[PDB]
Amino acid sequence: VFRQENVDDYYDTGEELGSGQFAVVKKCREKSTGLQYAAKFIKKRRTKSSRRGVSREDIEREVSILKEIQHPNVITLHEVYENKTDVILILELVAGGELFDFLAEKESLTEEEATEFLKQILNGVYYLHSLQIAHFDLKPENIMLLDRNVPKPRIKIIDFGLAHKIDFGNEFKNIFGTPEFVAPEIVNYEPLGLEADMWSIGVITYILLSGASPFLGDTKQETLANVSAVNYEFEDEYFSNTSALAKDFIRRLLVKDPKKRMTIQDSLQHPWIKPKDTQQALSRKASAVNMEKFKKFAAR
Numbered sequence: 001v002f003r004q005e006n007v008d009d010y011y012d013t014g015e016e017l018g019s020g021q022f023a024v025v026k027k028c029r030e031k032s033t034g035l036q037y038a039a040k041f042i043k044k045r046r047t048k049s050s051r052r053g054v055s056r057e058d059i060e061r062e063v064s065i066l067k068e069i070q071h072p073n074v075i076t077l078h079e080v081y082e083n084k085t086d087v088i089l090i091l092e093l094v095a096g097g098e099l100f101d102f103l104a105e106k107e108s109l110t111e112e113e114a115t116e117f118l119k120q121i122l123n124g125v126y127y128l129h130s131l132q133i134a135h136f137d138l139k140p141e142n143i144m145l146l147d148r149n150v151p152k153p154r155i156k157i158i159d160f161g162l163a164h165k166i167d168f169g170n171e172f173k174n175i176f177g178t179p180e181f182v183a184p185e186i187v188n189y190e191p192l193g194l195e196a197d198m199w200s201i202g203v204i205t206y207i208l209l210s211g212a213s214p215f216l217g218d219t220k221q222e223t224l225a226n227v228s229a230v231n232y233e234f235e236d237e238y239f240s241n242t243s244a245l246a247k248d249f250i251r252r253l254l255v256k257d258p259k260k261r262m263t264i265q266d267s268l269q270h271p272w273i274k275p276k277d278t279q280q281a282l283s284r285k286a287s288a289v290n291m292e293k294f295k296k297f298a299a300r
Contacts, residue, residue: 002080002081039091071123071127075159095147112284134164188228194263209294238293249270
């Protein structure tokens, strides 16, 4: 059971900010404080038999995950309402748009500058994993900015509709997510855990440095074969001004066996992320993101 009052008693709701299949997001303003939020209206599935709406079980999972988390790089739940047909999540307002679109507006980006945005994603996932929460849905459109018009912008990780508590005593298996971004164990209906987020971080980093999707094929089913076999390459047309350390980073994340894939702790320590000496910090300032190609990717 959630707040029963009419959301309109405490909030002035405004214009639409987007819409998944089962949700509408509007801008809103809390009457008692004048602060701005965003109200996500999730459609309740009313009859078990129905394909429309979201089950109570899926909403309660999202909400109790969201209630549980408090960190500068993940989105904050303010408050939760419900009525006959919806569950209404009052969420923090993330106004800066997708990180990839903002990066596409620069004249260039060194591997050094890129690592500073990526450190923010790494910190968010670090916090999550330390609470045994797997996001299960990391992809660029879920990496946002609080505010784009400031010196050093803050990354916000959004969208917990797929997130789960990993419980030590029981396998979790499922197929879900976007084919280009999901790990092999997801594709193959094998046991899942925190390692899937690590594979998605690999896919994101690859795209950030090159503007190419590592596993994207000509049809959905080709993309899945690509993922499952770990069929990827660093082709020179894309990666020829990309350092050895960045390549090694991606390679330790894009790995079929999840027990052998890098952990979140391991990756905060990797020498691409934390240089150990002058040669390593040099060649990271010296290396550039492939900007011409990258811009094209955020353009599609």
